[PDB]
Amino acid sequence: QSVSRAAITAAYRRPETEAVSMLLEQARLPQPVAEQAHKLAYQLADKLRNQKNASGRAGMVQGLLQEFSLSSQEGVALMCLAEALLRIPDKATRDALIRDKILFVNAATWGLLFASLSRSLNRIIGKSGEPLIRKGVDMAMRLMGEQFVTGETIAEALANARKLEEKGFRYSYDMLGEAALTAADAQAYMVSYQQAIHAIGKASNGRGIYEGPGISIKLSALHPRYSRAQYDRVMEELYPRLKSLTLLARQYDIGINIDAEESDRLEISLDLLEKLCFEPELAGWNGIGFVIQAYQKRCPLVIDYLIDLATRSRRRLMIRLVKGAYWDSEIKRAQMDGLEGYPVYTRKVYTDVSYLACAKKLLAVPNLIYPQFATHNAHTLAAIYQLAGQNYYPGQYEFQCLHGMGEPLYEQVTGKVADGKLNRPCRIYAPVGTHETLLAYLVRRLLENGANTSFVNRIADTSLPLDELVADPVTAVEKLAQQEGQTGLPHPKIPLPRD
Ligand SMILES: Cc1cc2nc3c(=O)[nH]c(=O)nc-3n(C[C@H](O)[C@H](O)[C@H](O)COP(=O)(O)OP(=O)(O)OC[C@H]3O[C@@H](n4cnc5c(N)ncnc54)[C@H](O)[C@@H]3O)c2cc1C
Ligand SMILES: O=C(O)C1(C(=O)O)CCC1
């Protein structure tokens, strides 16, 4: 194998204490940079919470709830009398009433500022059955998934883009659908991507790979049963499709990004990337995109490979750095194979340290990589902004975020300094499709929003202080090493696969 390639295979499942200890010093921000990252992260997160004055509103609740000292339900019943007294139009009537004589409709809305259904459930199922089950699951899937979808068709989504593109946001469009099971399914996904490239290209109109929209694709949509697909069949069947779409994105000069999926396909996607990058028809073109997952132990080794690849094939690569979306499934997979170890980290803070270390690796080679830092975590953003150094220029890097999750945070980021933003561009990942293609994406978003470890989850918990929410991962890791006795131990509730 190649020297860069061999090192990747060597790190597939390396001990977690080993991996974390190596990344730790590459991820440590120097004390001056670290404090500036702290301030900016604190500001971003504070404005995200006290947006509708959610923080200070809870303060006046706790204050009057102290002085008067009654139930939380008692406080809500007080607001209801207060609101109905404020609805008395004449003051002299209201006050004389307060002293002479002395409805709960909006107590619901007031409660938010402060088991019998289980009977209905067991009851409803018996008479209704697997039809009721399959309908309700579909129903909640559409209802929860609306917020994550840009449009049902490529044309409806291109239209939805202008509002934010006029403010300096970019877009990457994703035609939903993945893990093709039949040659037909893969063929159809091939069609909907070509149709999308045309639409997004006519829309782009020469704006170019950096400043115009682009497209994101999944190899697993392009080949039947990609899960266990063999090497020779993938190159004969998938690669010509990957080539074709990429040629097409070049003619329109739009970025085309290869999404990263489950970790046992990292090898094969590198093989496809390696061949794509030496097509003569793509020589001198820099529009090829590739996601790397910082939660994998071999991400730093992939970066060394990609850096060498960009040199050998004489192009600048567009590399989306992400943490990763399949962590639950990666762990359950590794636990069932009883394999040597895990390919991903087992403590969330380890992934953050991985991400910070990989970001520095990417920022050091602007001639060979255009970094695209995908994240919704205020501290992560703040740290990359500091790590990228003074004297920003547009093509140095960009941020990325998911439709439905990133806009509140990046609206402090993309925009003019005069209007109080950071003047850094953000590309919004924009899914496109109907109900029939939303399931796997939605589930991954439910796993993301619902985890106690996720930034977007903890920012909502106004009982968690901002200083803990934006705390520094290197320091977190070193605080554990000192309490536990050694740097980088696996998560306690997650033993090694064979145990
Ligand atoms: C625009 C965009 C494109 C993306 N494309 C891809 C892609 O092609 N492939 C892909 O896999 N991901 C991709 N992601 C990432 C994924 O979808 C999540 O959005 C991302 O991981 C969340 O990171 P965050 O820094 O915003 O949140 P943070 O909450 O600070 O990080 C959360 C992440 O930490 C990781 N994590 C959670 N628990 C643990 C644990 N116990 N041990 C170790 N690690 C843990 C998971 O990666 C989790 O998602 C993309 C994200 C964005 C924004
Ligand atoms: O991580 C992934 O593969 C993404 C998904 O959830 O489909 C693409 C953007 C996140």
The one-letter amino acid at 476: A
Pocket of ligand 1 (CB under 6 A): 259-260, 291, 293, 295, 320, 322-327, 344-348, 350-352, 374-377, 380, 400-402, 429, 448, 451, 453-455, 491
- Of the chain, the end-to-end C-alpha distance in Å amounts to 32
Distance CA(29)–CA(32), nearest Å, equals: 8
Distance CA(111)–CA(61), nearest Å, equals: 11
Q: Which residues contact 92 (CB under 8 A, 6 or more apart)?
A: none
- 326 alpha carbon – ligand 1 mean position (Å): 8
If you ran DSSP here, which 8-state letter would residue 32 be given? Answer: H
- From the alpha carbon of 347, which atom of ligand 1 is closest? 42
Considering every ligand atom, which ligand is closest to the CA of 403? Answer: 1
Considering every ligand atom, which ligand is closest to the CA of 440? Answer: 2
Pocket test for ligand 2, best of 220, 441, 448, 454 (most atoms within 8 A of CB): 441
Pocket test for ligand 2, best of 172, 173, 259 (most atoms within 8 A of CB): 259
Considering every ligand atom, which ligand is closest to the CA of 172? Answer: 1
Pocket of ligand 2 (CB under 6 A): 259, 261, 325, 429, 441, 444
Nearest CA to ligand 2 atom 6: 441
Half-sphere exposure (Cβ direction) of 78: Cα atoms closer than 13 Å: 13
Phi, psi of 473, rounded to the nearest 5 degrees: -65, -40
CB 362, CB 319: distance < 8 Å: yes
- 429 alpha carbon – ligand 2 mean position (Å): 9
Residue in the block written with tokens 């991996």: 19
Nearest CA to ligand 1 atom 11: 324
Taking the C-alpha atoms of 282, 286, 287 and 291 in order, what is their torsion angle to the nearest 10 degrees?
110
Nearest to 269 by CA among 295, 300, 293, 285: 293
Nearest CA to ligand 2 atom 2: 325
Residue in the block written with tokens 């207060």: 82
- 133 alpha carbon – ligand 2 mean position (Å): 27
Nearest to 430 by CA among 399, 405, 455: 405
162-165 long-range contacts (CB < 8 A, ≥24 apart) are 164/407, 164/428
- From the alpha carbon of 176, which atom of ligand 2 is closest? 7
- From the alpha carbon of 326, which atom of ligand 2 is closest? 1
- 101 alpha carbon – ligand 2 mean position (Å): 62
Phi, psi of 370, rounded to the nearest 5 degrees: -95, 105
For residue 182, what are the CA distances in angstroms to 225, 235, 354? 7, 17, 37
Distance CA(156)–CA(452), nearest Å, equals: 35
Total Cβ atoms within 10 A of residue 137:
10
For residue 372, what are the CA distances in angstroms to 172, 214, 286, 293, 434? 12, 13, 14, 12, 28
- Which residues of the chain come before a gap where C and the next N are over 2.5 Å apart? 102, 114
| DSSP-based three-state secondary structure for 322 | strand
Look up residue 136 and give its two tokens: 């309700």
- From the alpha carbon of 402, which atom of ligand 2 is closest? 9
- From the alpha carbon of 444, which atom of ligand 1 is closest? 17
Half-sphere exposure (Cβ direction) of 130: Cα atoms closer than 13 Å: 0
Q: Which residues are paired to 370 by β-bridges?
A: 318
68-99 burial code (b ≥16 CB/10 A, e <16): eeeeeeebbebbbeebeeeeeeeeeeeeeeee
Pocket test for ligand 2, best of 174, 444, 454 (most atoms within 8 A of CB): 444
Nearest to 430 by CA among 176, 172, 196, 177: 172
Nearest to 17 by CA among 340, 481, 355: 481
Resolution (A): 2.2
Task: Measure the CA angle with vertex 441, ends 429 and 232; round to 5°.
Answer: 90
- 292 alpha carbon – ligand 1 mean position (Å): 11
The one-letter amino acid at 33: V
Distance of CA 273 to the CA centre of its chain: 23
The one-letter amino acid at 319: I
What are the E-state strand segments in 104-262?
170-175, 214-217, 255-258
| DSSP-based three-state secondary structure for 457 | helix
CB 416, CB 410: distance < 8 Å: no
Rounded to the nearest 10 degrees, the angle between the axes of helix 130-145 and helix 116-128 is 120
